[PDB]
Amino acid sequence: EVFLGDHPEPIYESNLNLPSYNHNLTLPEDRG
Amino acid sequence: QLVRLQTELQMCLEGSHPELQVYYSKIAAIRDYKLHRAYQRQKYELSCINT
Amino acid sequence: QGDNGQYARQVRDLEEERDLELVRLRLFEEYRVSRSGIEFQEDIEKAKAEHEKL
Amino acid sequence: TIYERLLEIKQMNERVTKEINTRSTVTFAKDLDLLSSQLSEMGLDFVG
């Protein structure tokens, strides 16, 4: 499976180098 | 005393005499406090939905 | 290699089913944010209005 | 009878005081005002 292309290693959140996005959450501090 | 009491009454029914201004800096704090609590609720909820 | 007429016909279904997942995820997050906003708006209105009544 | 009870309390004293003195508060519980302070409006908390 290493030589077929598949990754037999465990793939975690930090291996899928997914591109980070941004919606309008995580408000600033005390802005009210 | 009629002069003084009604002068203060119609100088106060606008909102300027001391007694009504000692209960207004004591209730604006309560409203500010409730609003800060609302804001903190929304902040935590949205940063939870994110993760 | 990967070009097998049957291993290339079911990978595409595993993909067609992974993407409906993400569509559901995004629509659901939209609804969640709408819910939180409704609650925040109602609570602010109540605080201000009843403070003034008081 | 009285002496033995007081003795067990004075054996637990050290761990109990350095446990109540290193108490933490969970920040979101402080900001959403979920905790209570009845035993602090009365001084009944075992401060340092």
Swiss-Prot record, chain A:
**Subcellular location(s) of the protein:** Nucleus
According to the lineage, what is the superkingdom? Answer: Eukaryota
Give the quaternary structure: Component of the RPD3C(L) complex composed of at least ASH1, CTI6, DEP1, PHO23, RPD3, RXT2, RXT3, SAP30, SDS3, SIN3, UME1 and UME6.
Q: What else is known?
A: Present with 1630 molecules/cell in log phase SD medium.
Function of this protein? Component of the RPD3C(L) histone deacetylase complex (HDAC) responsible for the deacetylation of lysine residues on the N-terminal part of the core histones (H2A, H2B, H3 and H4). Histone deacetylation gives a tag for epigenetic repression and plays an important role in transcriptional regulation, cell cycle progression and developmental events.
Protein family membership: Belongs to the RXT2 family.
Name-wise, this protein is Transcriptional regulatory protein RXT2
According to its UniProt entry, this protein's organism is Saccharomyces cerevisiae (strain ATCC 204508 / S288c) (Baker's yeast)
Identify the segment of the full-length protein shown. 216 to 247 of 430
From Swiss-Prot, chain B:
Indicate where this protein resides in the cell.
Answer: Cytoplasm; Nucleus
What does the record note on quaternary structure? Answer: Component of the RPD3C(L) complex composed of at least ASH1, CTI6, DEP1, PHO23, RPD3, RXT2, RXT3, SAP30, SDS3, SIN3, UME1 and UME6.
Q: What does this protein do?
A: Component of the RPD3C(L) histone deacetylase complex (HDAC) responsible for the deacetylation of lysine residues on the N-terminal part of the core histones (H2A, H2B, H3 and H4). Histone deacetylation gives a tag for epigenetic repression and plays an important role in transcriptional regulation, cell cycle progression and developmental events.
This one is known as: Transcriptional regulatory protein DEP1
- What gene is this protein a product of? DEP1
Curated annotation (Swiss-Prot), chain C:
Residues annotated as transmembrane: none
Give the location in the cell: Nucleus
Coiled coil region boundaries: 6-54
Function of the molecule? Component of the RPD3C(L) histone deacetylase complex (HDAC) responsible for the deacetylation of lysine residues on the N-terminal part of the core histones (H2A, H2B, H3 and H4). Histone deacetylation gives a tag for epigenetic repression and plays an important role in transcriptional regulation, cell cycle progression and developmental events. SDS3 is required for the HDAC activity of the complex and for the RPD3-SIN3 association.
Q: How does it assemble?
A: Component of the RPD3C(L) complex composed of at least ASH1, CTI6, DEP1, PHO23, RPD3, RXT2, RXT3, SAP30, SDS3, SIN3, UME1 and UME6.
**Family in the record:** Belongs to the SDS3 family.
Note on file?
A: Present with 105 molecules/cell in log phase SD medium.
**Protein name (database record):** Transcriptional regulatory protein SDS3
Task: Tell me what organism the protein belongs to.
Answer: Saccharomyces cerevisiae (strain ATCC 204508 / S288c) (Baker's yeast)
Q: Which residues of the full protein are shown?
A: 56 to 109 of 327
Curated annotation (Swiss-Prot), chain D:
Disulfide bond residue pairs: none
Compartments (UniProt record): Nucleus
Top-rank taxon: Eukaryota
From the record, what ranges are coiled-coil? Answer: none
Any idea what job this protein has? Catalytic component of the RPD3 histone deacetylase complexes RPD3C(L) and RPD3C(S) responsible for the deacetylation of lysine residues on the N-terminal part of the core histones (H2A, H2B, H3 and H4). Histone deacetylation gives a tag for epigenetic repression and plays an important role in transcriptional regulation, cell cycle progression and developmental events. SIN3 also has a RPD3 independent function required for normal longevity.
Q: How does it assemble?
A: Component of the RPD3C(L) complex composed of at least ASH1, CTI6, DEP1, PHO23, RPD3, RXT2, RXT3, SAP30, SDS3, SIN3, UME1 and UME6. Component of the RPD3C(S) complex composed of at least EAF3, RCO1, RPD3, SIN3, and UME1. Interacts with ESS1 and STB1.
Record's protein name: Transcriptional regulatory protein SIN3
Q: Which organism is it from?
A: Saccharomyces cerevisiae (strain ATCC 204508 / S288c)
User: What's the encoding gene here?
Assistant: SIN3
